[model samples]
Structure formats: C-alpha cells, structure tokens
Target: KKFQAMPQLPSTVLDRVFEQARQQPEAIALRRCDGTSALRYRELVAEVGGLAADLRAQSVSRGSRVLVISDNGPETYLSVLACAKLGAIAVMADGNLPIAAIERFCQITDPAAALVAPGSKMEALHSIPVIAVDILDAASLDQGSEDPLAMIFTSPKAVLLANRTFFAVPDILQKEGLNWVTWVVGETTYSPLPATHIGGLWWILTCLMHGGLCVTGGENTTSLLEILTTNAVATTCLVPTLLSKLVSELKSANATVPSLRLVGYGGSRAIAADVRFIEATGVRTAQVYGLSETGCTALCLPTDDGSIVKIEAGAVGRPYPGVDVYLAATDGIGPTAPGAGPSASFGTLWIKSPANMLGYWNNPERTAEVLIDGWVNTGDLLERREDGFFYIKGRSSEMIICGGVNIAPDEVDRIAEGVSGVREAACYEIPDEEFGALVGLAVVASAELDESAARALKHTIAARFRRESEPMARPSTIVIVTDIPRTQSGKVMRASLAAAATA
Candidate 1:
C-alpha cells in the first residue's frame, strides 16, 4: 500500500539550500555536538561557494569522482555541497572502510582526485592525487536528475545516486517526494551515526533541507546524553547498539528526555525491551529501515494519535510513497499473507522504486544480479501482513535448507539462544551431498563449551525444536566455539562460520 503521493519537486537540491539561505540568513544550518559555533545558512552557502572555487582551481571538473575523506564536521558537509555545485560526484569514503574495499572502489570509480583530512594516516593509497581537506585552508556536481551525483562504497557494492533523488527523495526522475523532513522545520535533530554511514547522512540532509539544526557527531554514551538535553534535540535516529546504550544511560540516571518527541532505531535489529523502555518515557520510537540503494525513504512513521499499539509486531512499517515492494519466489510472486506451509510465508523481497541506485557504479554484472527490469532483488526473505507491514525473516543467503524445506536460520539461532547455557549462537548450513544443505549450529556457552557438553546440549536443543513444532529448524550438526566472526558493524560473517563448520 502506498503511503502518500509524491509530487514534482525542484530540479536541484543545493540550489534549494542556497535559496533557503538567501531567505533565512541567520538560521543555524548545522552544529557539532562537541559545541562548535553554529554555521548559519548564509555562512554555510558562502563556505560552500569558497570551497567550490578552490576545487575548480585544483583542476577538479564536472563529472569528476572526488574521494572525500574528511570527518563528520562542517568541512565534509561543505565538500558535499561544493561538489554538487560543480556537477561532480563526491565519493563519500568512510575512514573505517576496509582497505580491500577501498581498493575495489578505486578500481571501480577511478576517482580523479581525493580530499583527505589534514594528517590523515593514509594507507592503501590508490595512486590518486590527494588534497588535505582543512576547510580554513581548502574548498570543494553537475549532471541530470538521473545522472550519478554521489556514491558510497558499502562493502562489495558501490551505490551511485542521482542529484534529484539524493536531494528530493523518492526521485524527481518520476514524481518527487518532499525533502525527507517537512513537519519539523527548525527543530534540533541529532544522531549518533557518523557521516560514513547512509543512516547518518540521512538525518543531516533532513535537517539541512528542512531548515533545521543538525547536531552531529557524539560517539560516547555520556556525551550523547548531555548533547540530547543541552541542545534540546527534538528528534533523533540511532543505530540499534547506540540506541540501547543511550537508553541504558537514561534509565540508570533515572532521567527523561522531555524535549525529545520522536526517535528512530535501525541499521540493525533493535531489542524490543530497549524500545519499550524508550517509549515508556513518552518518546515515540519507530523502526526505520532503508538501504544504501534506496537513499532516503522511511518504511513508516508513527501516527500522531498514538496508533502504535501493534508496532511491537516487529514490522518495519510501510515503504514511503512512490515506492513499490514485492515479494518474489522461485515459483511466482507471493501473497500478502502466508497461504500455507513454511516456505509460503517467506520470499525474497524485490523493490521497484525511482529512488533505487542508478546502478552499482560501473559494475553492471553486479547490478544485473539485483537490478532487473526496474526491480532490484533485495535477497532478504520477508513476509507482508494483511495490514500491509513487512516482517523481515532473514537474509536469503543465510537461509538453511533441509530435505527440500526452507527454514529461517535466525529461528534456529533463537532456539539455541533460548537453551539454558548458551551465551551466543549462530546457525549456518551443513553441506549434504544428497539433500544440498542441512542445519548447522555453532554456539558459545557461558563456560568453555566442551565435547561432552556439546553432546548433552544437542539433545535438549533437538527436543526444544520438536516441542515448538519446528523439527526441521533443529540443527543436524552442532559445533561449540568461543567466538563468532563479525563485521565492523557487528553483523555475523555467516559464510566464514559455515565454511569452518562444513569443513
């Protein structure tokens, strides 16, 4: 179901911001949570203009892929707009991205130049001319609404977004939605997410385009709590881990965020207990899910009349207006609700949206796998309720198959976690020559997991699955280990786990 209609918007985004600056010269466009002086709208425009001129003098031209490596401060944000003014593509490179990933991006985008932070410990340098991006010392796209404007390297894929869609979301390529935030103009917004992540950049643009104050960069828990109350932040969004820590700080202090009206949790699965704790303070908590592909669309927003009774159902709300979500199966398209059987309730999610990436920046083969006939296969298994909300089951790549039946690995992990002595659990695949794959489980117990303990645990684990009528979800093999491999963001490296288990 569509949320609302997105109308036609202006052709360019920075122009809109500059125009807004012309009208409201003294409004605070941005400020750092570390208490730097606010950059008013007019000041921001002037700085953007200065940086654009400097970048042009350094031989940066329109269509150039300039690597931007500054921190989440005014300088990086300035580079973003300055590049936009020049019709260039600002490849926002995260400082924390893996060296191999950066190498791949260098090979792919072939950046003409780079803007780095002063004295940035440069390693994995990719032969591009580097300029230190100290705003006081230095300065910083043109193209069609559908042309590549900005790019971000998220692991194997580099997502390229166009000018119109990056600014006025849901894409001005077709119909345009309002800038991400329209309701809460001039309100103070804060996020613990860094500029490196799409989740962080979303809030920054929302505050900028809507003429509000965006207080950026608070990495510590106590610092964030102080920033929240000191800045009178009316709205915020947080990655799940950060959100949990923030609330944990609040409860221990026996405090309340009186000025905070709304908060969103995403980037990872949020703990229901923590969310409930947040909502208990009367601060509305909504789950916001977006991909690097789909720039700035919310799955859903809570109602003003408090119609969030069923929100605890773990549905990621509704997709924004002008976006189409479909559930795809090998057989055909799946229904809104499960018909029967286990597999019927789940299918790979396919999204057709104007806001989807132009393509994976020069990687057509990778694009072809996901983007097909205007629909991108998300590779995530999800279920849609009769009420039009989406419940993500698990990643299709991480799914376990046993005797031709599909089972959610997360379900198996949950069953293991429910076991008495288990501290952490991971469910993976055990290769079976005849059956293709079997359920494989790896877990960390509270104490050292011994061979005898493992054998004893498996019996109870199988019993629990049968008791829950999920015998197929039971692991065919169990491996006890001390550590589960994880990415920087704490996502399980399932392939590595399975490789070890199957080997």
Candidate 2:
C-alpha cells in the first residue's frame, strides 16, 4: 500500500534549520534590538538561501573566507549562513579591536571579501575587497552555477543521513582569497569581539538556526539601547561588560523588557552589579559557559534566583544532552574521587561531544596536547557540585603560584566581587623576583565613591576572606581603573592585565 502524501526532510544544516522554520513558520524566530524588523523561520530560510546564492555569485566558492565585522544584527547571521551554504568560510572579527589590530587580522587572514555595516570603514589592506552588508543582497553578486557546495561529513558513518554515505566538496574557487580550510564566524554584537572566536560562532549559528533577525551596529551603550528598546529584539547574547552597559540603560528606564525572552552572556562571569541590573529589567537572562572546543554552551546557568544558587553552588548545570563531561584531577590523570566534596577540585575540564572542533588550524602539536582520544582538555579547572552543576575555577595556565601555593584567579574574583564599593574585579599574577608570583587586582569603583570609600571597600574585602581564601588571596596591589580591559565576549583578558601589571 502506498500513500500519496509524504513527509519533508532536510539534507544540510541550512536545510535542517529551514525545515524547522517551516514547521514553526509563524513563530517569532528572530528579532534585532533595533525596531527595524523581525523574521519568521520561513522567511529566514528563503532570505538566507538567497543570500547564499548572492555570495556564491560573488566568486565566494566553498571554503573561501568571508569576513564579517559588525555588532550583533540580522545581517551578521544572514552573512554567516550565506557563506556556509556556498561552502565559504566565514571569519568573524572581534569588535573591541582597535584599527591596528583589525588591520593586522585582515592582513593575516587575507579574506576574499569583507562584509561590514554601512559607513563603518576599516582601513588597512585597501586592496583586500570589501562590501557593505546593506548592499550585499541576493542580487548583489553575479549569478553562478546553482548547486549546493559542500557535502556534510560526519565523523561516524552510522550517523549518515538516508542513503548519502559520502558527499563531495564543490569544485569552486574564489579568485583572490586564500583557500580558508576553516569557516569562521565573528561577533560585532555587544561583545565587540571578532567572529573568529568561539563566542562569535555561537551568536551567528544560534540565530541562523531559527532564521532569527540580527541587528547590526549598536556597539556602544546608546546603540545597544536602540537595538533593544526600539528594535523589540527578543533574544540576544553578550559578555558581562556589554551587559553592564545595557544594565545601566535599563536602570535609567525604571522599566523592564516585557518583550525580550532570552538574554545570554558568556566567555566570563557577569559582575554582581550587571547581574542585578538584568534581573531588575525582568528579562530571561542566561549565563552560558563554554569554550571554542565545546561549540557554544556546554553548561548554562540561568540568571534567575534558583539558577543562580545552582551555579554559585558550583554546578555548570547538567551537560547538554549530546555532550559528556568528566572530571580529571589536577594531576591531569584519572577522574577525581567519586562523590568528592566541592573542595576536591579537578585539574582540567575534559569534554567529549559531537560539536568538538577538528583542532587548531595548523598547529598539530598544540592540537595533540589538547585533543586526545576525541576529548578536548579545556585547560580549565572545574568542580562539580552536589546538584550536578559545573563551576569554572580558572584556566590551568592562569593559576598563580606564590610561595608554592597555587591560587586560581577566579576564586579571588568571586571574593573580590563581594566587596562593597567594588563594582567588579579582575585578578591575575604578576612576576615577582622573590615570591615567583604576586597577586594583582584590577578593580572598577562604584559610582558612589568618596575618599573614605576606598579604604572602607578594602577593609570589607580583607575581613570577609581573611580566613576562607588563601593567605595570599589579598592582592599585593590594587589598581584603580575606569573599566577592566575585557574581550568583546565580556571575559576579562587576565593575561593582558597581568602583563600590564608587570610592565
């Protein structure tokens, strides 16, 4: 017996998400912070597919580099998939990069074409081609042979879709660009970081998967407000620094985001002040934790009270359904003792997931050190809590050794944030001739500060952790700064700060 009607299925990542959009066509899939527009999944599929065609026409062959640099917006997501569909590699640039850094990156990556927001000009390699995202529509590129570029290659043969066992990479080439073996995704959203990093990839794909709208530009506090309030964007991600600015605006509004459903921040911990602000705004905020090797978020902690306690208690929450998490002792060996208390911290975080990357671009030795037996040694120290949540202590390399006692900076940061008048803090180790390493705290003072306030804040911090924290926990020096230097993803670049301390 045969039926006349049959079901539809997806053959590619683009196809799969498009099928999702079709199934939930009317659902509000994505919205930009600016009130400019919103898109349903159905609309997104067509637009992205059309954009893919446009990119292909531009001679952006499969595996060619298409660089995107802009704050979070609709165009960013569209451009990502547009390149992905054409089998072109998308390189995301960090937003916080100064003109020099951006230029250096361009010269190094040597992209075929660069996409940026209108009026946003990056001066460097002028010869490298560039295009304004506004003009980069389906019609922008010259039409080309209409064919899907790259075949989906799964690690496991058993996971093959239908009868397609193996697929071929399209015989396409971009005239001038380097043959980018890796596809890159950049974030210009609030993070101000390049798309080349893990966070950038997360932002682009997360939205494209649902055909969501991405609002471009809006880099600073004012622009961010325009995107959120005027745009009616429902979901967005940011690092704590950007989130802090957004919080400042929300505080002024004395209002809440009734429309926004999801607000995500990762790459670093959101300061207590920033966290409080988001909660006040009444948005569903999630603190996602992950690395480039783990795709986007391996463990997520929602910003709400129940979830906060879960994370503060040291649970990265449960592992994603597909990912596996195992604790390896600091010895870099076997798992930590079963049922070990919170104090029994793991040496490094190891993850096994389908989403794990192939490896660093060309550094085989570096790849061998981190990726072993299909597991990514995240180089992060973690502790699993009673509730099954994971907490990141700090990077293994970032640990400070002072007088033979190893100290993780994050633990110090946690204690520092608790200090009054201290809006936030970043701790790192400074080289010391005698002690081998010295602790340094880069702190941002709260607006309500006076001459006596500084002393009071210091006294409060020293008293709170005089016992529980390490004896050398108190910073050898405290540098007052307007703002902590941070990666666009809201993560404080402790290494940079540490270098500054010594310099």
TM-score winner among the candidates?
1
Itemize residue pairs with steric clashes in candidate 1: 51-139, 51-140, 83-141, 84-141, 87-141, 87-142, 88-141, 88-142, 299-318
The CA lDDT of each predicted structure is 0.67, 0.55
Q: Write the per-residue lDDT of candidate 1 for residues 1-503, one digit (tens) a residue.
A: 24323334445667666766766778888766766635888788887777777778778888898888746766667778878788888888765566776666677788777776442346466466776655321222134557666887685668887765555443331244333234366788886776667777666765677677777652334556777988899989887677766766786778888899888767765444456567778887667667777664536544333223333334566666666777665534332335623333356776766667777887878787777766666666678766667775332454677777888877778878998988989887776899878888888877765566566776777677668775666777787766665644666656545644443
Question: Measured by TM-score, how close is model 1 to the native structure?
Answer: 0.70
Instruction: Determine the C-alpha RMSD for candidate 1 after optimal superposition of all C-alphas.
Output: 9.1
Instruction: Give the best candidate by lDDT.
Output: 1
Give TM per candidate. 0.70, 0.59
lDDT of 2 by residue, 47-119 (tens): 6776666666667775576666654555665566576666675666644557776675565455677777442
The per-residue C-alpha lDDT of model 2 at residue 361 equals: 42
